[PDB]
Copies of this chain bind each other. A is one copy, B any other.
């Protein structure tokens, strides 16, 4: 009971995917999640209550 997902694209602008099967009983044995790419800068660059529209003054 296998999974097929896409490969990271290389040297050019269907054969661009790979297949994987897990052979172990523990999730710890699995390979790394190198393909997950989320992001949320907000937690850090903009943790202000009161939304700053910035195109407007920011004070006044």
Contacts and interface: CB of A to CB of B under 8 A. Distances in A.
Interface of A: 1-4, 7-12, 14-19, 21-28, 30, 34-35
A2 B19 CA distance: 8
Contacts of A10: 26-28
A9 to B, nearest CB: 6
B34 A15 contact: no
B19 A7 contact: no
Nearest to A24: B18
A24 B1 contact: no
B3 A25 contact: no
Q: Which of A1, A4, A34 has the most CB of B within 10 A?
A: A1
